[PDB]
């Protein structure tokens, strides 16, 4: 397990905190990091994000041992099952119909992490020289950037810049992206909701983390930075020190 801490803030302009997440432990004290961004533009985003977080917590705490070679399959199969359960929960309740959430999560191992991603929450590794975004945003503007219809700078001003193209809960099927990243020579793992990186640039995160300070020091500084940049969203992240 890593030294890790969860940080969240409703922010200024939101009725609810619809982000969710946590740091969970199974029966042999292996660590799972979870972050979910419930959709603000649909009903009941906090129900969706807390549903997925609660399911991952309960499923993981029920396990004895998931070794590294088992982890991609465990994450893929549980995300698909949770997506299925969330979809039908929303379909059975008119006040929840259409709800959904992103999810980024990470199973921690000695020298590596296994990450699953659905949506436009992110995972990064950071060291003194670089910050690498491991995940790829499932967002409509990322689609527009990859098809070369807009530049990445326009994405910050585009009228549909909040639309996401893969989400938990809105269809009975989902296909998460899985990543395996070696941790050697990195200093930090960061999982975050778009409330952070829609407003704080990658080099700003790197500059903050490369200074001395504890995980709690850095996370409070990073939250204050997102707020100083006038984030209009819930802001959530897990910061973990590699080691
Ligand atoms: Mg809402
Ligand atoms: Mg280093
Ligand atoms: Mn949200
Ligand atoms: Mn977004
Ligand atoms: Mn958000
Ligand atoms: Mn530091």
99: CA distance to ligand 1 center in Å?
9
User: Is 38 annotated as belonging to a binding site?
Assistant: yes
The interaxial angle of helices 215-228 and 202-209, nearest 10 deg, is 150
Q: Check whether 217 is labelled as a binding-site residue.
A: no
The tokens describing 148, both together, are: 């070369």
25 annotated as ligand-binding? no
Residue 169 CB neighbour total at 10 angstroms: 34
Q: Distance of CA 191 to CAs 6, 27, 117, 173, 186, Å?
A: 9, 23, 11, 24, 14
3-state secondary structure of 161: coil
The percent of the chain in helix, strand and coil, each rounded to the nearest 5, is: 35, 25, 40
Q: Running DSSP on this structure, what letter comes out for residue 172?
A: S
For the chain, the distance separating the N- and C-terminal CA atoms, rounded to the nearest angstrom, is 10
Give domain limits for the chain.
1-243
Alpha-carbon distance of 241 to 243, in angstroms, equals 6
CB-based contacts of 51, cutoff 8 Å, min separation 6:
82, 85, 86, 89, 101, 169
Tell me the CA–centroid distance for residue 48 and ligand 1, in Å: 10
**In terms of C-beta density within 10 A (0-12 exposed, 13-18 middle, 19 or more buried), how is residue 195 classed?**
buried
CA 167 / ligand 5 centre spacing (Å)? 12
* CA 182 to chain CA mean position, Å: 19
Asked if 79 contacts 40 with a C-beta cutoff of 8 angstroms, the reply is no
Using the structure block, give the residue that is written with the tokens 């639309």: 163
Resolution of the experimental structure, in angstroms: 1.6
Token duo for residue 196: 């952070």
CATH no. of 1-243: 3.60.40.10
Instruction: Provide the 3-class DSSP secondary structure of residue 36.
Output: strand
Burial of 122 (0-12, 13-18, 19+ CB in 10 A): buried
211 assigned binding-site residue: yes
Q: Assess contact for 99 and 90: CB atoms under 8 A.
A: yes
Query: What is the rounded CA–CA span in Å between residue 140 and residue 137?
Result: 9
């Amino acid at each position: 397990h890593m030294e890790a801490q969860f940080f969240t803030d409703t922010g200024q302009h939101r009725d609810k905190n619809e982000d969710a997440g946590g740091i969970f432990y199974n029966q042999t004290n292996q660590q799972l990091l979870v972050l979910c961004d419930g959709m603000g533009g649909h009903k009941a985003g906090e129900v969706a994000s807390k549903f997925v977080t609660d399911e991952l917590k309960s499923r993981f705490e029920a396990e004895n041992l998931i070794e590294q070679h088992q982890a991609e399959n465990w994450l893929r199969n549980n995300i698909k099952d949770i997506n299925f359960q969330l979809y039908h929960y929303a379909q059975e309740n008119a006040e929840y119909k259409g709800m959904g959430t992103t999810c980024v999560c990470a199973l921690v191992f000695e020298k590596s992490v296994v990450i699953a991603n659905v949506g436009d929450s992110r995972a990064y590794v950071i060291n003194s020289r670089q910050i690498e975004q491991i995940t790829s945003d499932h967002s409509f503007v990322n689609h527009l950037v990859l098809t070369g219809q807009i530049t990445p700078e326009e994405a910050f001003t585009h009228p549909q810049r909040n639309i996401i193209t893969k989400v938990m809960g809105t269809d009975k099927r989902v296909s998460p992206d899985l990543f395996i990243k070696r941790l050697n020579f990195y200093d930090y793992l960061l999982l975050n909701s778009d409330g952070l990186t829609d407003y704080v640039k990658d080099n700003e995160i790197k500059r903050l983390l490369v200074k001395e300070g504890t995980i709690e020091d850095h996370g409070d500084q990073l939250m204050q930075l997102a707020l100083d940049n006038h984030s209009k969203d819930n802001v959530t992240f897990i910061l973990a020190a590699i080691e």
